[PDB]
Amino acid sequence: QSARMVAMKAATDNAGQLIKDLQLIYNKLRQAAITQEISEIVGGAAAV
Amino acid sequence: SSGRIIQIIGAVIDVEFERTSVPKIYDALQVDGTETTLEVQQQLGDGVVRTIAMGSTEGLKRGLTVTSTNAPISVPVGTATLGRIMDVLGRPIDEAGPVATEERLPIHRQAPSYAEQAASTDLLETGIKVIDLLCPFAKGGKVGLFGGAGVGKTVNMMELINNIAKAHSGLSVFAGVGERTREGNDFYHEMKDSNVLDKVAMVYGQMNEPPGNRLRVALTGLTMAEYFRDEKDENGKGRDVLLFVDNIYRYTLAGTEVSALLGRMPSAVGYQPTLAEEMGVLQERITSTKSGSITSIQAVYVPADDLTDPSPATTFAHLDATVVLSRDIASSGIYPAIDPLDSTSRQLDPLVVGQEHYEIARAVQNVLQRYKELKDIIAILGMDELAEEDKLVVYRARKIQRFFSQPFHVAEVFTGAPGKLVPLKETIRGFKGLLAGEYDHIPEQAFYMVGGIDEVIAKAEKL
Amino acid sequence: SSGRIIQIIGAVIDVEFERTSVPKIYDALQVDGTETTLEVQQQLGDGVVRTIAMGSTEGLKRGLTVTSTNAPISVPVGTATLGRIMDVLGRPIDEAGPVATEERLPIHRQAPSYAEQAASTDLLETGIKVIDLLCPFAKGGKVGLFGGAGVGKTVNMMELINNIAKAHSGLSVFAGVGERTREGNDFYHEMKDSNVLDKVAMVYGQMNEPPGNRLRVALTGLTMAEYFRDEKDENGKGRDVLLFVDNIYRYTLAGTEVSALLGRMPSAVGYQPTLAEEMGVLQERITSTKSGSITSIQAVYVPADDLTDPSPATTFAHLDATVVLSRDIASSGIYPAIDPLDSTSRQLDPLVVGQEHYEIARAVQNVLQRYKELKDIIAILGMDELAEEDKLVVYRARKIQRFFSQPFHVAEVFTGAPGKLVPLKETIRGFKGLLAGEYDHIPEQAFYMVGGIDEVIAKAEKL
Amino acid sequence: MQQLNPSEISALIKQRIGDLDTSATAKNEGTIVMVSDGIVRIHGLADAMYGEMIEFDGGLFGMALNLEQDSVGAVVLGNYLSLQEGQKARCTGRVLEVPVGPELLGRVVDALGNPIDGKGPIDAKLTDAVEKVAPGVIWRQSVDQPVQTGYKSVDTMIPVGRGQRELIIGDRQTGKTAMAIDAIIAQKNSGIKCVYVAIGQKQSTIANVVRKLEETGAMAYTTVVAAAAADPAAMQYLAPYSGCTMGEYFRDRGEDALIIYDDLSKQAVAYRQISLLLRRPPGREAYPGDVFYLHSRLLERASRVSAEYVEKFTNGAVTGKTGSLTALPIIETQAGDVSAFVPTNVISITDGQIFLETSLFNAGIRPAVNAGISVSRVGGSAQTKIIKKLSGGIRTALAQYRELAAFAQFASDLDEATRKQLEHGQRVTELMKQKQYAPYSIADQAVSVYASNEGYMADVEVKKIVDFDAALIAYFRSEYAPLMKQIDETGDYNKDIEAAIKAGIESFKATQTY
C-alpha cells in the first residue's frame, strides 16, 4: 500500500511537469501560427 | 453593340464597350470567334468590364470581337432532360444527340420568400435500419456524407436512389461537383443497368473545366430541380426531389480560387470572402415549399480532417444531418460502415420520431458507449474477471453492431444484393427486444447480414 | 561611355546609361571616384538598370559617374593563387604582393552536362566512430554538417581538416563565408604552422563585409576548384580536390537581404523566391566529373535549429553525405553531438559496406529507436515497472551513446584530454561486442569520452 | 493613383508624338522592354496568344502568359543571360509540340526532347502539342486490369490497376524512387511501356538511376525526361506535361503505359515562384489558388478509356484493344504533416494513397509502408481472384494487431486469446519486409501468405521467418517450377491448386525442415 502511494505520487509529479511543458508548447505554437497568418494577410493586402 | 478583348489574365477576361450600352451582370457574352461564352462580373466603367470565360481560354487575342446577349444563361429543362448528360451550358455531352425541349430558364434567380416557405416538417426515411434509427430525416432535408476511405460511398448513394426510384416518381438528380471521372462513368453504367435515366439527368464538373463552369453546375442542377419540383403535375402538386452533390467543398474551393483574381482579398483563413452569401443563397434555394419538397444530399470530405476551418462550420450552419463513416467498421464486414457515435441528425427528437423511437435510440447508444468504456477492462483483464453484469451489455452491443447489417440491394455482391428497407416499426421492435435481452441468448451472427426479426430468428435456426 | 547614380537604397544601386550603351547583365562597373565596383542584376530599361555594390556604400552621392568594363567578374586563376589570402575580388589581403599569374576566369558559368558526371565510389576512413560507422563517404561527394548555432559546425570541420588534410596529398581550397574573423585568422595561423598552407589557398568573405560582397563570395573558390579539377596534370588529369563550404546559409541569408530591395516578392517565410534555383545553380557547378575528382565539405547552419525550414529541406536534395547535430546531445555534454538517426549516407550499401558493417549498423539504430520510443513511458513511469529485456536494452543503448563519446585532437583545447583516432575495425568489434552483451556487467561510466574498446576495458578495470 | 506602366519609354512616347499608325508592324513582332530573372516584358505583338510560342533575335524561344493593356510578360525557355533590351521577338503561330513515338525506348532527352544521352539525334516522325484536354467520360471503361508492384502489403493491401490514381508520400530517403523503379522493374515481364520524369534534382541522381536501369536492362523499353535543379524553372514547370503527352501517345494506340513523377511539390514551388514573377495575386502560402486546377487538369489525363475512342483515334485501324494509362505522383512530407496544403489538395484527387513511416525504415523496413492509413479506394477489383481472396484474412489480422496494440506495452496482463492474436499479428508484421530490386512473383507472396494463414509460420521463430520464406521460395523453385509457372501465368485459384500448394508446403517441411 505504501509503495503504491509513492508510485502514484510520482505519477502525479510527472503529469504536472508535463502539464507545464504543454502550456508552454501551446503558447509558443499559437504565437507562431498567429504571426504566420498575419504575415500572409499583410502580403496579400499589398497586392491590390 | 459588341466589345473587344482588352486584357486576358488566367481566367480573368476584360473587354471594352460603348458607354451607350453595357451588358449587365450574369448575362451571356458570346465570343464572336468561337463558341466559348462569358458572363459579366464587374462593370468597370467606360465600357470596361471584368469577366470570366465559360470554356477553354485558348484562341483569344486582345481586341477580338465578342457579342453580348443582354440576358443570363437559360438552359433547357423538361422531361426531355431525363437520361441526358449535358455541359454546364445545357448542351448534350453524352453523345445522346441534340436536346428535345426548348423550355430553358435563366440560371440565376432570387431567394424564396419567408411566407411562401413550407410551414411544417414531415419525416424523411430510408428504410435502412442504421440510418433511420440514428439519422432520420425530414422531407426537404440536407445531409452531409463525410470522408469515405474504406468503401465507395457511391454504393450508398446508389442504394438511396434505388430507394427513391422504387419508392416514387419524386425525382432525383446527382450533379458531378468535382467528381473524379471513374465514379461518374461507372455510376452511369449501373444507372443505365437499373435504367433509372428516366428519372435522372446528369452534369459533370470535371476539375478540368474552367472554375466558373464547375462553380455554376451547382446553380444548373439547382434550377433544374427547382423547376421540376415546382412543375406541378395533374394535381397542382409538386414532387419530392432529391439532389446529390459530389462535394460542395469543391465548389467552395473553386470560388475561393476565383475570388482573388477579381482583385478581391481572400477571407481571413484565405477562402473566398463571399462564401457565406453564395452558400446560403444555395441553401435557401434548397427548401421544401407549399409546392413540393426540395431536399439534397451532399457528399462532403473534410479537408485535413479539421472541422475548425470555415467550410465545415458553414455546412453545419446548414447540415440537417451529419453522417460519418469508418473504414474499420467497414472492415468489420459491415455494409453501412456508419458511425453510430459521431453521426447525428438534427431531427432526432421524441416528437419528430416519437418518444419511443427517440428513447430506443437513446438505449442503443447507451449500450454502445457502455461497451466502448468496457473495452479497456475487456482488453486488460480479459472477459472472465468481469462479472456477468455488463456482459449482457457486451453481448447486446455486439449483436446490435451485427444487427446493423442491411444487405444492400447493391453491395459488392455477397448476399444476392437484396433491398431490405425493413419498416421502421419492425426495426424498433427488434432493437428494443434486443436491448431488453429477449434474444441475448442468441448469437450475434444471427443478427449478421440479416434484416428483420424474422430474418434474425430464421438465421439463428440456420446457424 | 559611362553611367550616373540616380538613387541609393541600402546596398543596391541604379544607374542611367546611354541608349547606345547598355551593359550586359553581369559586368564590373567601376565607381569613377572610388575603388567601389558594381554588378548588374536587373535590366530596368529605358537607359536605366539596377546594380549592387561591393564594398562600402558610403562616400556615394547621386549623379556621380561610373564606367563599364564590358567584361563580367573574371578573377585571377591558377596555382599562383595558393598559400595566399584573397578578397571577394580575388585580390591579396595577406599583403604578400600581387598574384603572379595573369589568367582570369569569370565567376559565372553554366552547370556541367549530364554526360559528364562521375561515379564517386571511393570510401574513406576518418577515425570518428559515428561518422565512419553511419556515414560511409564517396571520395568526391558532398558533405554537409547540418547543425544549429553553436553545435560545433566549425569544430567538426577543423578536426576533419586535420584528419582529412593529413590523410590526403594534393589540392585543397578554403573560402571563409560570413563568419567570425577571429576563428578564421586562428585557422590561418594554424595552417601556417602546418605546411600544406602552401598546398591550399585562403579567401575570406566575412560577416563584416557588405551583403553585396557577401553574396558572390563562393563563386570565387568554387570556380578555383573547378579549374583545378579541369587543370589536368601532364600525362594525366586533375587531382583530388578538397573543398570546404562555410555556412552557405550565409549566402542564402544575403539573398534574403537583397530580394525586397530588388523589387522582388517575399517567399512563404520571406526568402527570395529564386532561392531554390540559385541554390541548385550553385550546387551543380560542384561535382567530380569524368575529369578530376572534387571533394566538398559543407558547413550547414540550421536557423532556429529547425529542419522544416525551406532552406535545409532544399539542402537535403543536394547532399549525398548528410550529417546532423543536436542541441540536446550537447546538453548531455557529449562532444561531438551528432544524431545517429537523421544523418545518413547513400553509400550505406551492403554490396559496398560489407555485410557485417551493414547489419551491425542496422541493429544499433534499431536499439536506439526502441530506447527513444520508451523514453516517454520511462519518464512517466518508474524504470523498475518495466520488462527486464526492456531495461537491458535501455542500458545497452545508453552504453552505446557513451561509447560514441570521443575526444578529438583539437577538442583538447577546452578539455585537455588527448584526442583519439579509432580505426574502424576497433569500432566494429567493440559495437558488436556490446550488442553481444559481453559487457552487461560493466559500469556505464566505463564508456564515456573514450576511443576503442580496449580503452573501455582499461577504464572499467581502472574503475 | 496609377503607377508607371512597362510601356512609358520616351522612345515610344516620341514615336507616338510622331505617329499613331503602323501598329507594331501589325503586331508581327514586339520589342524588349523589361528584363529580369528569366522574365521579360515586351511591347507589341498583341496578335499573339497566351501560350503562343515566341522566337527571339537571339534565336531563342520563350512563352508569354500575360497580355496586359499594352505590355506582355514572357518567360525564357533556355538561358536568358544572353539577352538585352531593344531586341525583338515574333509569334510562331503555334504552341509547344514535342516529338511523339516509340522511338525512345531506352532513350533520355530534354524537356524539349533534346538528346542528353549524347547518342545522336533522336529519330522522330510525330509531334504533339503539349497542352491537351482530357477525353470525355463517354469514352471511359471500368478499371479492372491488374498492376503488380512485387511488394507484400502493396500488391495485397493496396490494389493497383491500369489507369488509376495513386500517391506515395513520405520524407527524404524513404524509398520514394525505390518503389517507383521497382514497379519499372516489375514491368520487365509485363511487357508494357513506362516513362519517368525528372524533377529538379541533381544530375548525378539521374545518372545513377539510369545506370541501375541498364543494370536491369529496363532502359530498353523506357524513356525518361531530365529536368535538373539548375535548369530554368520553365522547363522544370513544363516537362511533366510532355511526359503525359508521351504516354497518351501510346494510350491512344491502346497499349498499357505508366508515367512516374518525382515530387511534383518541387514543380509546384517553381510554378509559384514563376507566377509570383507575373505579379499575380499570392494566396495561402503565397501560392495562387489556381495551383489545384493546374495540377488536376494535368492529372486527369490519365485514365482507362473505351475501345470506341481507340478505333476512332485509329480511324478504326485497331479496335480489339482498349487504351489505358496509369501514373504515380510523388509528394514529400514535411515532418509527416498531412494537413499540409499541397498534399491535402493532392488527396482530393487520387484513387488512393500510400504512406511510409521513418520509424519503420530506421527499424530496418524498406519500404516501411504505413498500412494503418494507406488505402486504395479502387479495391481488389483489379486484383487477381486468388490474391483478393487471401487478402481479407491478412487485412483483419493487421486490423486486430493495430487495434490491441494500445496495451501491447505489456503482454503480461492480458488473456491468452490476446496473446495468440499478438503472436499471429506480429508474425504477419514479419514476412512484410523486402529487399530492393527483387521482383517478387505473385506465386511467391501468395504461397507465403497462405502458409501464414495455415499456421505454418505460427510454428517457427519470428527471428528466422524471413529465412523461412526465402528457403520456401528457393525450395519451390527447385521442385515446383512448373507449378509457379502456372501460378504467375493465371492469377485464378482452384482447389487442386490449394492441395498441391499445401502438399508443396508439407514437402518443404518434410523435404528440408525449415
Ligand SMILES: Nc1ncnc2c1ncn2[C@@H]1O[C@H](COP(=O)(O)OP(=O)(O)OP(=O)(O)O)[C@@H](O)[C@H]1O
Ligand atoms: N527494399 C529496400 N531494401 C533496402 N534498401 C532499400 C530498399 N528500397 C530502397 N532502399 C534504399 O533506400 C535508399 C534511399 O532511398 P532512394 O534513394 O532509393 O529514394 P528516395 O526515397 O526518394 O530518397 P532521396 O531521393 O531523398 O535520396 C536507397 O539508397 C535504396 O538503396
Ligand SMILES: Nc1ncnc2c1ncn2[C@@H]1O[C@H](COP(=O)(O)OP(=O)(O)O)[C@@H](O)[C@H]1O
Ligand atoms: N569536439 C568537441 N567536443 C567537446 N566540446 C566541443 C567540441 N567542439 C566544440 N566544443 C565546444 O562547442 C563550441 C561550439 O563549437 P563550434 O563548432 O564552433 O560551433 P558553431 O556551429 O557555432 O560554429 C566550441 O566553441 C567548443 O567550446
Ligand SMILES: [Mg+2]
Ligand atoms: Mg557556427
Ligand SMILES: [Mg+2]
Ligand atoms: Mg528520390
